Write a protein that binds this ligand. Structure first.
Ligand SMILES: [Mg+2]
Ligand SMILES: [Mg+2]
Length: 424
């Protein structure tokens, strides 16, 4: 039986922190107040020859210098009640503190995590601040790192309040922390983007078991799926990612053996950084993401050519999200607030959600002992019928974390059509 023990829990602060100051939140941040905390982690193998002397200490000290540039990670959220029955939220850069947890897991190895068909559930215990919802950030920490020691490696799992960063900002922080630990770079910015049509203090009103399998998509197989989708749909602008999304969508829906006339939903995150008044990079340390939903009937998706039809439907639905579509969602949010909710582990669902991105630099995170051999999103926001996409080790490849009931994943694993362009 895999188990985990906490070796030490300590509070950490940003060094050379100024006086207290506040940061205002956009609806991109506020929409996640009901969501679990954002969680991402990286797995490292320790070959017998590797020298890991002083590792935990160098990881912590390099983390302290990284926090010098990310003051909000040690603050707390600040809710301001309004006599309007409404609320507003800010980030108070407190230097109040973040968590640094040193832990150890027994009877679980790097190799087991890599080779097991289904993720050992103990790995979810590698992430700190589990279960926490993001509105609890007024008193609970906004940031925590857990370094868990395995018999043949370590796992570094982070948790950052999802109303503070999205995944793009999240992996920018990890990238930076790993740069510093290896042996500076431009300075990010937490100042939020506001159109002049909205005054910052935004006010609003408030409110079967899961298995996980990792399916690999080689560079070559992605190009195959991109071609097939464009060919079948008679198009050229169906992206690599849209073709993968539709390929896994077909496998999941096939495994449900549902009715061909069933109305389906496929939810995607739309990075909106290349649509701001001045464009920004992952240097923009905040949320800049909108949720879009692609609709389709099950028979349309599963019929021959449905790879092309589903992908083109994704293509066209995304295309609707230009600068003016996003600007109006932003300003209309106060009026009609939208929130990401968790829900629980349904035995069956017409909706599939996908998150993360293959453009995150997930393997370029050498702390001084090597690049990671694995990447995982945390378990707090994982439910059945959710998928997370990251790049794989191989250049141009992708890995899909697919969270579903055991028998669905088994079916998908036996699906001749799906496994023709996927392994694992
Ligand atoms: Mg836990
Ligand atoms: Mg990449």
């Amino acid at each position: 039986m895999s188990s985990i023990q906490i070796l030490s829990t300590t509070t950490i602060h940003a060094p050379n922190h100024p006086n207290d100051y506040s940061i205002d939140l956009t609806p991109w941040d506020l929409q996640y107040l009901t969501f679990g905390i954002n969680q991402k982690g990286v797995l490292y193998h320790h070959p017998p020859n590797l020298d890991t002397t002083n590792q935990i200490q160098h990881l912590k000290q390099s983390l302290l210098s990284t926090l010098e540039y990310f003051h909000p990670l040690t603050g707390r959220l600040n809710v301001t009640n309004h006599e309007d029955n409404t609320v507003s939220y800010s980030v108070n850069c407190n230097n109040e503190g973040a968590l640094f947890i040193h832990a150890e897991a027994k009877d679980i190895s790097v190799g087991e995590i890599l080779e097991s068909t289904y993720l050992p559930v103990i790995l979810y215990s590698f992430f700190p601040l589990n279960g926490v919802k993001n509105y609890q950030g007024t008193t609970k920490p906004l940031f925590a790192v857990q370094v868990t020691e395995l018999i043949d490696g370590i796992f570094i799992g982070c948790a950052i309040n999802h109303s503070v960063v999205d995944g793009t900002a999240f992996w920018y922080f990890i990238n930076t922390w790993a740069k510093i630990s290896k042996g500076i770079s431009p300075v990010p910015s937490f100042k939020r983007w506001f159109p002049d049509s909205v005054q910052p203090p935004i006010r609003f009103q408030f409110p079967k078991p899961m298995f996980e399998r990792l399916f690999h998509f080689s560079k070559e197989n992605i190009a195959k799926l991109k071609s097939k989708a464009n060919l079948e749909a008679g198009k050229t602008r169906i992206s690599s990612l849209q073709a993968v999304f539709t390929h896994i969508w077909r496998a999941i829906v096939r495994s449900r053996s549902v009715d061909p006339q069933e109305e389906l939903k496929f939810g995607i995150d739309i990075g909106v950084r290349p649509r701001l008044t001045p464009p920004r990079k992952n240097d923009y340390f905040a949320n800049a993401v909108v949720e879009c939903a692609v609709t389709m009937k099950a028979g349309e998706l599963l019929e021959d050519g449905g790879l092309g039809k589903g992908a083109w439907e994704m293509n066209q639905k995304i295309a609707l999200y230009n600068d003016e579509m996003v600007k109006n969602l932003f300003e209309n949010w106060s009026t009609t607030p939208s929130f990401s909710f968790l829900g629980s582990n349904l035995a069956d669902s017409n909706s599939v959600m996908i998150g993360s991105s293959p453009w995150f630099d997930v393997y370029g995170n050498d702390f001084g002992w090597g690049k990671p051999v694995g990447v995982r999103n945390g378990g707090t926001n994982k439910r059945n019928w959710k998928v997370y996409v990251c790049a794989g080790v191989e250049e141009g490849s992708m890995n899909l974390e697919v969270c579903l009931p055991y028998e669905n994943l088994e079916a998908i694993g036996n699906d001749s059509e799906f496994m023709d362009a996927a392994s694992g």
